[PDB]
Amino acid sequence: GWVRPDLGELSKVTKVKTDRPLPENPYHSRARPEPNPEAEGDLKPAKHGSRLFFWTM
Amino acid sequence: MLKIIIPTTMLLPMTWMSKHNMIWINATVHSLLISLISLSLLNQLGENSLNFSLTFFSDSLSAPLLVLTTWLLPLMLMASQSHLSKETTTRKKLYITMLILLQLFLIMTFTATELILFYILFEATLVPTLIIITRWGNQTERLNAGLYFLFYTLAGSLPLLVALVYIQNTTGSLNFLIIHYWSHPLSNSWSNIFMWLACIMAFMVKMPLYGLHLWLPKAHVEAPIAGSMVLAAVLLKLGGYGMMRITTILNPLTNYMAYPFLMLSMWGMIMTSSICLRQTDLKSLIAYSSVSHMALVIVAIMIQTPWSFMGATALMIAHGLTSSMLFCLANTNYERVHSRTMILARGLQTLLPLMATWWLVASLTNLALPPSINLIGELFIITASFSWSNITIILMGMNMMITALYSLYMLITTQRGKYTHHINNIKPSFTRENALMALHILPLLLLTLNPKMILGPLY
Ligand SMILES: CCCCCCCCCCCCCCCCC[C@@H](O)O[C@H](CO[C@H](O)CCCCCCCCCCCCCCC)COP(=O)(O)OCC[N+](C)(C)C
Numbered sequence: 211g212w213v214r215p216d217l218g219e220l221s222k223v224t225k226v227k228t229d230r231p232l233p234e235n236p237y238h239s240r241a242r243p244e245p246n247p248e249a250e251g252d253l254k255p256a257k258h259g260s261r262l263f264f265w266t267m
Numbered sequence: 268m269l270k271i272i273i274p275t276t277m278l279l280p281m282t283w284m285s286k287h288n289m290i291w292i293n294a295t296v297h298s299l300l301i302s303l304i305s306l307s308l309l310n311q312l313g314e315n316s317l318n319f320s321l322t323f324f325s326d327s328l329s330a331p332l333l334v335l336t337t338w339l340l341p342l343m344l345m346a347s348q349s350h351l352s353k354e355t356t357t358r359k360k361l362y363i364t365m366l367i368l369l370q371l372f373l374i375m376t377f378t379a380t381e382l383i384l385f386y387i388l389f390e391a392t393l394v395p396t397l398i399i400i401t402r403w404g405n406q407t408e409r410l411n412a413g414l415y416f417l418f419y420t421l422a423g424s425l426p427l428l429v430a431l432v433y434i435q436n437t438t439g440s441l442n443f444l445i446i447h448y449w450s451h452p453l454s455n456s457w458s459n460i461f462m463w464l465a466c467i468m469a470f471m472v473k474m475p476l477y478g479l480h481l482w483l484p485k486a487h488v489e490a491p492i493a494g495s496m497v498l499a500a501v502l503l504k505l506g507g508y509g510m511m512r513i514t515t516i517l518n519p520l521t522n523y524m525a526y527p528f529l530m531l532s533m534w535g536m537i538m539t540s541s542i543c544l545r546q547t548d549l550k551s552l553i554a555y556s557s558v559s560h561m562a563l564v565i566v567a568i569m570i571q572t573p574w575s576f577m578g579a580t581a582l583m584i585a586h587g588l589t590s591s592m593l594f595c596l597a598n599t600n601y602e603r604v605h606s607r608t609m610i611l612a613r614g615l616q617t618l619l620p621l622m623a624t625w626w627l628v629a630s631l632t633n634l635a636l637p638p639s640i641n642l643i644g645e646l647f648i649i650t651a652s653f654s655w656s657n658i659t660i661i662l663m664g665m666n667m668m669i670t671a672l673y674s675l676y677m678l679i680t681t682q683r684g685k686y687t688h689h690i691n692n693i694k695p696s697f698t699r700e701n702a703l704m705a706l707h708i709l710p711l712l713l714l715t716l717n718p719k720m721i722l723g724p725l726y
Pocket residue numbers: 302306331334335338584710713714716717
């Protein structure tokens with residue numbers, strides 16, 4: 211009683227009912243390094259200007 | 268300080284918007300008025316300074332130099348009026364522009380609260396002088412002279428810049444007040460020795476130091492009269508002013524490092540005074556006399572005692588005035604005889620008696636006759652040197668004797684004796700020349716009445 215699969219059926223993406231657990235770390239990665247501080251604030255004018263040599267602004 | 272800087276800047280559009288035959292009158296009048304305004308900087312304090320702003324400050328060392336700089340421009344214009352007669356209006360305006368730019372740079376240099384700003388203006392003064400020398404000089408050597416006057420200067424000044432920025436990378440500032448208040452001793456190290464040399468050599472070359480004085484005779488001889496006046500009166504004093512400012516960070520290393528320069532100056536004053544005795548050119552003799560006087564000023568600054576500093580300030584002012592007068596007298600002779608050879612035109616007393624009186628008074632002030640400010644500075648420096656070491660008196664007295672000898676030799680050769688027979692184009696002295704001579708000499712004899720105005724901040 212076997213019916214031959216039609217064109218376009220064996221190439222389908224199907225779902226699998228499995229009871230095997232999903233690997234939590236399949237890549238065996240290390241812990242990612244901590245990011246840079248990402249400072250935030252509200253801008254204020256540069257103190258006493260550019261402070262480059264004799265320039266007062 | 269802007270109440271002096273802005274009018275000096277306005278001198279330029281006024282010069283360039285003037286009539287073709289009003290440039291000299293307008294320039295002279297407004298430069299005299301600027302001098303009169305600048306005369307009010309002389310009201311100095313016994314305390315710190317006249318700190319106008321973050322950029323400019325005045326001091327009783329800076330104020331006499333500023334007033335002399337402002338006073339020199341009208342005299343330079345009066346001296347230049349004669350030999351620029353046959354030249355186009357645009358070129359005369361350019362010449363006056365060069366003089367005005369030189370005054371502006373000198374004024375900003377002498378106040379210059381910042382050391383880098385001081386360096387920038389102190390090197391910006393180089394360009395107008397070089398253009399004046401190499402454009403409106405007469406002989407073919409002027410170009411060569413200009414080259415010397417350029418490269419010597421830069422050969423000294425390029426290391427200084429490096430040193431300067433290095434200091435600000437360590438101290439954090441180059442403001443003179445902060446430097447003075449936060450000064451610290453220099454340890455005896457090779458790095459500190461080379462920092463000392465980089466700080467000193469730039470100002471030493473423009474005094475000039477005896478071994479480094481080759482550029483001065485060329486530059487002063489080949490320059491026009493205004494160029495010679497500004498070179499001898501103000502530009503030579505930039506080195507002394509810079510040393511007086513910068514020696515505050517060089518202690519106690521100055522005690523050891525001063526010896527070669529002290530020996531060079533003490534022997535070179537004798538050498539240059541002796542050179543003056545055998546000179547066939549008036550301008551070269553006056554230039555070598557300037558070298559001797561600046562050698563004495565170098566000794567005074569290196570000793571770094573209160574009397575040394577007062578004498579050096581007084582001598583700088585007096586030498587500026589006297590050398591400008593001497594160059595003007597030489598140029599009055601030259602514009603008649605066109606030779607600049609001292610032995611050629613002789614016995615000019617019998618033909619120009621008032622000019623002979625001017626020659627006599629100029630020689631007397633160069634000779635350091637008391638109670639002139641020339642002798643005030645001379646004696647203060649000599650006493651400080653005697654306290655430094657009693658053996659300096661031999662060299663100092665020998666220098667005094669040779670100075671008197673060559674001054675009176677210069678007077679006798681040109682004014683006394685018999686007139687040269689074949690020279691018949693010696694015209695009577697103009698009112699312009701006599702006025703120029705009086706405007707040189709009355710300030711000296713009038714400053715001898717109030718010496719504290721030119722004795723500096725340690726008075
Ligand atoms: C032709 C023959 C002679 C005829 C004339 C006869 C008369 C001669 C008299 C004049 C000379 C004699 C000397 C006597 C001096 C008397 C006046 C003197 O005593 O006053 C001086 C005063 O004069 C000044 O001190 C000196 C003048 C300053 C000179 C400034 C130069 C002018 C600017 C020009 C540009 C600068 C070029 C140089 C740059 C450095 C000193 O006074 P002082 O005891 O102290 O205090 C003043 C009064 N107080 C007490 C109220 C304060």
